[PDB]
Ligand binder design. Structure first.
Ligand SMILES: Nc1ncnc2c1ncn2[C@@H]1O[C@H](COP(=O)(O)OP(=O)(O)O)[C@@H](O)[C@H]1O
Lengths: 49, 49
């Protein structure tokens, strides 16, 4: 059961790595969307100019 | 006889209008808008991938 548990926990560790990768991906996506919104706001300000 | 001729003179126009609307709708699910970020548009799904 020592070896069985170690292999299972290896699987768990790689699973955690994948989950963190997805989290940082979504964070980058939200950052990009914020940048796009502020760009549109700047465009409207320039239009009013 | 004349009534049937009249109906046949419009079936084609109605089919064309239906097909144009179907294709126009099928456009949006692929690209949509650049700031869509919905994970439904096929380009954002590739971007996050
Ligand atoms: N005018 C717009 N400008 C920017 N983004 C838009 C606009 N209209 C719709 N969207 C996008 O549509 C997305 C919502 O789609 P989503 O909720 O994934 O579809 P569903 O309702 O099928 O789940 C939002 O993230 C939003 O950015």
């Amino acid at each position: 059961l020592l070896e069985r548990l170690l292999g299972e926990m290896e699987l768990e560790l790689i699973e955690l790595r994948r989950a963190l990768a997805q989290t940082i991906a979504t964070f980058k996506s939200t950052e990009r969307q914020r940048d796009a919104q502020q760009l549109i706001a700047q465009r409207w300000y320039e239009k009013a100019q | 006889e004349r009534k049937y001729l009249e109906l046949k003179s419009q079936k084609n126009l109605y089919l064309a209008r239906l097909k144009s609307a179907i294709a126009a709708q099928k456009i949006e699910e692929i690209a949509g808008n650049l700031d869509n970020a919905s994970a439904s548009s096929l380009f954002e799904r590739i971007e996050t991938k």
